Each structure stands twice: as C-alpha cells, then as structure tokens.
Amino acid sequence: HXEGXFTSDVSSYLEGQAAKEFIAWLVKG
Amino acid sequence: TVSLWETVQKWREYRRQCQRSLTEDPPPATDLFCNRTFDEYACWPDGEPGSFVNVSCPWYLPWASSVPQGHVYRFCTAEGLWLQKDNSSLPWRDLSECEE
C-alpha cells in the first residue's frame, strides 16, 4: 500500500513528467 | 492525472486569448510604459515605468489548482524597458509562487 512504490505510480509519474517538461521548456528560452 | 496533450491544448488557448488581448487593449499613455508581451509562459500587460508588474499563475499549468493565490513578477524600469537578467537580454522574472 506504499504510495509511489507501484508500477501504476511510475507510469503516472512518467505521464505527468511529459507535461512538466513542456512547462520547463516554455519557461526557458 | 494531467497529460501533455491536455496541457498543450490549454497552453494554445491561453496564448490565443493573450494575443487577442495584446492586440485589442488600447495603447499605453506614454512610450515610457514597458510593452505588453507574451513570453511563451505568461501574458504580461503594459507596465508603468519604475514599477513591478504581476500576473496570476498561468491557468494552463498542470498544477494550477494547487497555486490559486500565486503571482509571477516582472519589473518595468523607468526607461520603459523590462528589467533584464545580467549578461543577457532575457527578462528578469520571479516565478517562484507558481512552481509546482
């Protein structure tokens, strides 16, 4: 039951990261 | 769980709305105001000379609902130029209230 310790957490983290890297790309220039 | 595609669509809409506003809003009272601009991240209005300018966290951020009170800051110099970061022409900005 440990949060962040399951494959579903890793897959959700990877998808969230796609959007966050887009944000970081916009912030840079 | 907010996806890249959802975020791109919101960003495009934020940009579209910003660009309409930049086009539509009446000109500043003097050329000493810093120019409104969309910097790829946030939509900035004209700035009074010698003043800080703030706008809300851009609403397309995946974590926007977690920063509903935050603002991002620029500084408009007395000459009508946005303050720049040293050894560059990038604008100074404080985005810390809108981080995840």
Side-chain angles (χ1 to χ4, degrees), chain A residues 2-29, chain B:
Chain A
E3 77 310 312
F6 288 84
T7 55
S8 64
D9 301 311
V10 169
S11 67
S12 295
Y13 180 76
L14 282 177
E15 293 179 348
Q17 280 311 109
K20 293 188 211 307
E21 295 286 359
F22 171 66
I23 300 309
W25 176 76
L26 298 171
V27 176
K28 298 320 173 180
Chain B
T1 172
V2 177
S3 78
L4 172 65
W5 178 230
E6 172 186 339
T7 302
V8 170
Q9 286 174 271
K10 294 193 214 163
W11 175 82
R12 266 183 209 163
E13 177 60 16
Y14 180 98
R15 175 178 63 109
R16 188 192 70 73
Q17 289 183 24
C18 179
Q19 288 177 338
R20 290 189 66 97
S21 285
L22 303 182
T23 302
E24 176 176 282
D25 290 337
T30 166
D31 200 43
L32 277 35
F33 274 55
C34 299
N35 288 329
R36 63 193 68 171
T37 186
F38 175 64
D39 65 12
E40 306 311 314
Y41 174 74
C43 194
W44 297 97
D46 296 327
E48 278 194 10
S51 71
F52 286 87
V53 175
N54 74 84
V55 302
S56 290
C57 296
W59 55 260
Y60 63 80
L61 292 175
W63 55 88
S65 39
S66 308
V67 290
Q69 315 177 244
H71 300 260
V72 52
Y73 304 87
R74 280 198 181 207
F75 182 74
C76 178
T77 72
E79 282 81 15
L81 305 176
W82 296 110
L83 185 70
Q84 300 172 50
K85 274 189 285 171
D86 297 81
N87 305 123
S88 82
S89 304
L90 292 170
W92 175 84
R93 290 180 314 185
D94 187 329
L95 279 53
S96 54
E97 291 187 15
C98 301
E99 315 275 18
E100 190 181 1

